[PDB]
């Protein structure tokens, strides 16, 4: 089938991507949580190893968002969602880098550190910026399969 | 016309308002979670004095992703989605009962009760049901607007 769809099918898998990204990252999130809980308890016998395997948990789902991440990358973006993508690309760089920070405090046993970091308002800016992503690109994907501005080019470096 | 158009749309918006129950649902742990942290700080502290402002936040993550989930059940769906969406139905109903539970253990600061309560089992099963959903979804959307339409009726009721 058809130019528009390649189009068309393009920005619902970006999205997906996106989506997929996001929902790994809070998973990352959920798990350094139950890890850093563990730590909290009355160590070895109980924990002190589910730490562990919580942990590594949390690098898994973080690795799995990263890759997510990388193949919302590899698809070339629509001209008019070149900038709402860049403003992804500022805030989950800075939710990644808050959530590879956090498993650093918590494999060296650092939960002052941990509970220091403003966490919660880099999640939620990645949240916010996710939200008006997919604003722009529904608003768009309108216009495509509706003919009311295709574009419908891929940006490029012709 | 586009009827088409409207039957397609409403699989993307019924794919929206389950994306937004689930990481609804997501942000519900977290917040269960950073409050049950707190209940373990606790003493002087001053990180700790958030424990009920955290459970409140769950609260209104929950209620918020239920809101999304009556949304999504506003939405008729097409006979070949029948099966998954029962599939969903099963896992959000498990897993927004687990959450409640979470939440009224907490409610009197029962750390021990919410730590035994097996949830991470009950939000895989809905986070794989909403994998499948989302599969089923992309390809019954492909089918229909590759055509032919015609022809898509939403479920009826009798």
Not at 31 to 58: G, H, I, P
Not at 73 to 82: C, H, N, R
């Amino acid at each position: 089938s058809q130019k528009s769809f390649v189009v068309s099918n393009q920005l619902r898998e970006q999205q997906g991507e996106l989506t997929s990204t996001w929902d790994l990252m809070l998973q990352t999130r959920i798990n350094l949580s139950r890890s850093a809980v563990r730590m909290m308890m009355d160590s070895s016998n109980q924990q002190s190893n589910a730490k562990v395997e919580l942990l590594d948990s949390a690098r898994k789902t973080l690795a799995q968002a990263a890759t997510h991440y990388k193949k919302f990358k590899s698809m070339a973006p629509l001209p008019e969602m070149v900038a709402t993508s860049r403003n992804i690309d500022e805030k989950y760089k800075n939710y990644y880098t808050a959530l590879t920070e956090l498993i650093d405090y918590l494999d060296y046993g650092n939960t002052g550190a941990y509970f220091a970091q403003p966490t919660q308002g880099m999640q939620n800016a990645m949240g916010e910026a996710f939200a008006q992503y997919a604003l722009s690109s529904e608003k768009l994907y309108r216009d495509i399969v509706t003919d009311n501005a295709d574009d419908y080019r891929f940006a490029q470096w012709q």
